[PDB]
Structure formats: C-alpha cells, structure tokens
Amino acid sequence: FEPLVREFNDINKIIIRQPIRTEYKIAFPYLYNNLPHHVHLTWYHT
Amino acid sequence: GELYLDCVMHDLRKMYSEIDIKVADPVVTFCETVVETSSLKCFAETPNKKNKITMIAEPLEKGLAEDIENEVVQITWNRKKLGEFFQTKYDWDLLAARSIWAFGPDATGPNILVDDTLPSEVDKALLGSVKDSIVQGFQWGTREGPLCDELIRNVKFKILDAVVAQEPLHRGGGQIIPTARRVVYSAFLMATPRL
C-alpha cells in the first residue's frame, strides 16, 4: 500500500539475538512499533 | 510474556496515557552463579582497621537450592530440626548443621550462610553481636548484585575466621555491614563467576 502517515535505541546497547521478523508487527502491533495509529486488533486463534 | 506486554502497551496508550512512547526490543532478566570452591580466600577490613571477615564461596547443590526455594529447608523452626533435615536429606555435617545463619535476597533465597571455625568460634558473645550485621550485609548484598545488579543463584558463602575487636559498641555493626557486603563481592568474584 501507500503510507498513511505520508540514546535510547543505541546499536551498542541492543542484543540482536534473533532478527526482528517483520510479521511480529502484525501479530503484536503495539509491542513491535512506535506510534501505531489507526491500528486494528487481530483475532488470532480458533 | 509477549501478549501480556502487548495488551498492557495497548492499555497504557489508549486508556490512560495517550502519549507516543519509544519502546526498545525486549531483553530478559539474568542471574548469577558459582560452580566451584573458592581460591586463596580474601579477608578485608573497615577503613578503621578493627574488624575483619574471612569468607570462602563454594556452591550448595542443585537439590539444596531448589528445596530452599520450596521453603522446606526454612530456618523458622528449631535449629536442631533444621539440622536433622539437612542430615536426612543431604548427608550434611552435624557441626555445620547447627551453625547456619541466614538465606539471602529475600525470606527464602537461593543462597546459604555457614560458619565452621571451631577453635576460633568459642568467642561467641563477640561473634553474635555482629552476626546480625553480617546478615544485614549478606541479604542486602545478595539482592544487590555485583556484575550488573542482577540476582545471585546457588552459591554458598562460608566464614572460616572471625576477627572482630573488643567492645566496638558503635563501630561494629555499622562498619561490618559494608564489610560483609565487600567480602561477599570478593568471595563471589574471585574464583568462578558464571551467568
């Protein structure tokens, strides 16, 4: 789609153990992003 | 877990605090341990050279630590019954069974504190005056954390010589508490720290 909007995160202070896989931003939207505006919740398991 | 903190961040943003929040990648909390007996032991005193503490570190076993975490090895009963439980469960020594002082960072922790200096611990009235200060330094330093202020799991601290001067009455406890803290640091750090 098109963009809807258009000393803390130091790279020497963050353990990159597993690469942040992009689908985490869908599966858990608040925890993996800053500013989640107009976000929708997901039904996740039946 | 993941969904718990996702839900509380949703709750934090939408229900109470509408402010945009920078949030880093989540890291776990860590702990510390020791796997072997201590080296040539350290004895350290106060800035005024009055009172010393001689302490080694050797690990209490897996069963010991997990059972103190299950409260069954609590010292709130008689010292004799606690010693009998140490005997009937771990082949523990009788002379070390009636000498254990405290536990560690909380009411039931993963550490233990033993005294065995049988020629030199006849000085009991002068040892028990600072025994509670050794406990007040011990619990506090075990909930502090030497390396990166985490907790200390499964380490035994054992005192082998008590050199405390005659009638301190103001110096003793207040100076021995950071001294007990520092000798805890030395006996932990000296021979085998692990994460």
Swiss-Prot record, chain A:
State its location(s): Nucleus; Nucleus speckle
* Domain note: The MPN (JAB/Mov34) domain mediates interaction with TSSC4 and SNRNP200. Has structural similarity with deubiquitinating enzymes, but lacks the residues that would bind the catalytic metal ion.
Query: Which tissues does the record link to its expression?
Result: Widely expressed.
Quaternary data? Part of the U5 snRNP complex. Component of the U4/U6-U5 tri-snRNP complex composed of the U4, U6 and U5 snRNAs and at least PRPF3, PRPF4, PRPF6, PRPF8, PRPF31, SNRNP200, TXNL4A, SNRNP40, DDX23, CD2BP2, PPIH, SNU13, EFTUD2, SART1 and USP39. Component of the U5.U4atac/U6atac snRNP complexes in U12-dependent spliceosomes. Within the minor spliceosome, which acts on U12-type introns, interacts with PPIL2 and RBM48. Core component of U2-type precatalytic, catalytic and postcatalytic spliceosomal complexes. Found in a mRNA splicing-dependent exon junction complex (EJC) with SRRM1.
Which disease does the record tie it to?
Retinitis pigmentosa 13: A retinal dystrophy belonging to the group of pigmentary retinopathies. Retinitis pigmentosa is characterized by retinal pigment deposits visible on fundus examination and primary loss of rod photoreceptor cells followed by secondary loss of cone photoreceptors. Patients typically have night vision blindness and loss of midperipheral visual field. As their condition progresses, they lose their far peripheral visual field and eventually central vision as well.
UniProt name for this protein:
Pre-mRNA-processing-splicing factor 8
- What does the UniProt function comment say about this protein? Plays a role in pre-mRNA splicing as core component of precatalytic, catalytic and postcatalytic spliceosomal complexes, both of the predominant U2-type spliceosome and the minor U12-type spliceosome. Functions as a scaffold that mediates the ordered assembly of spliceosomal proteins and snRNAs. Required for the assembly of the U4/U6-U5 tri-snRNP complex, a building block of the spliceosome. Functions as a scaffold that positions spliceosomal U2, U5 and U6 snRNAs at splice sites on pre-mRNA substrates, so that splicing can occur. Interacts with both the 5' and the 3' splice site.
UniProtKB/Swiss-Prot annotation, chain B:
Q: Does the keyword GTP-binding apply?
A: yes
**Cleavable signal peptide:** none
The record's GO CC annotations read: Cajal body; catalytic step 2 spliceosome; cytosol; intracellular membrane-bounded organelle; membrane; nuclear speck; nucleoplasm; nucleus
Superkingdom: Eukaryota
Query: Which of UniProt's keywords are assigned here?
Result: Acetylation, Disease variant, GTP-binding, Intellectual disability, Isopeptide bond, mRNA processing, mRNA splicing, Nucleotide-binding, Nucleus, Phosphoprotein, Spliceosome, Ubl conjugation
Q: What is its main location?
A: nucleus
GO terms for MF: GTP binding; GTPase activity; RNA binding; U5 snRNA binding
Quote the subcellular location field of this record. Nucleus
Which BP terms from GO are recorded?
A: cellular response to xenobiotic stimulus; mRNA splicing, via spliceosome; response to cocaine
UniProt lists the family membership as follows:
Belongs to the TRAFAC class translation factor GTPase superfamily. Classic translation factor GTPase family. EF-G/EF-2 subfamily.
Disease listed for this protein: Mandibulofacial dysostosis with microcephaly: A rare syndrome characterized by progressive microcephaly, midface and malar hypoplasia, micrognathia, microtia, dysplastic ears, preauricular skin tags, significant developmental delay, and speech delay. Many patients have major sequelae, including choanal atresia that results in respiratory difficulties, conductive hearing loss, and cleft palate.
Functional note: Required for pre-mRNA splicing as component of the spliceosome, including pre-catalytic, catalytic and post-catalytic spliceosomal complexes. Component of the U5 snRNP and the U4/U6-U5 tri-snRNP complex, a building block of the spliceosome. As a component of the minor spliceosome, involved in the splicing of U12-type introns in pre-mRNAs.
Spell out the subunit comment: Component of the U5 snRNP and the U4/U6-U5 tri-snRNP complex, a building block of the spliceosome. The U4/U6-U5 tri-snRNP complex is composed of the U4, U6 and U5 snRNAs and at least PRPF3, PRPF4, PRPF6, PRPF8, PRPF31, SNRNP200, TXNL4A, SNRNP40, DDX23, CD2BP2, PPIH, SNU13, EFTUD2, SART1 and USP39. Component of the pre-catalytic, catalytic and post-catalytic spliceosome complexes. Component of the minor spliceosome, which splices U12-type introns. Within this complex, interacts with CRIPT. Interacts with ERBB4 and PRPF8. Interacts with PIH1D1.
* Full protein name: 116 kDa U5 small nuclear ribonucleoprotein component
Underlying gene = EFTUD2
Give the fragment's position in the full-length protein. Answer: 633 to 827 of 972
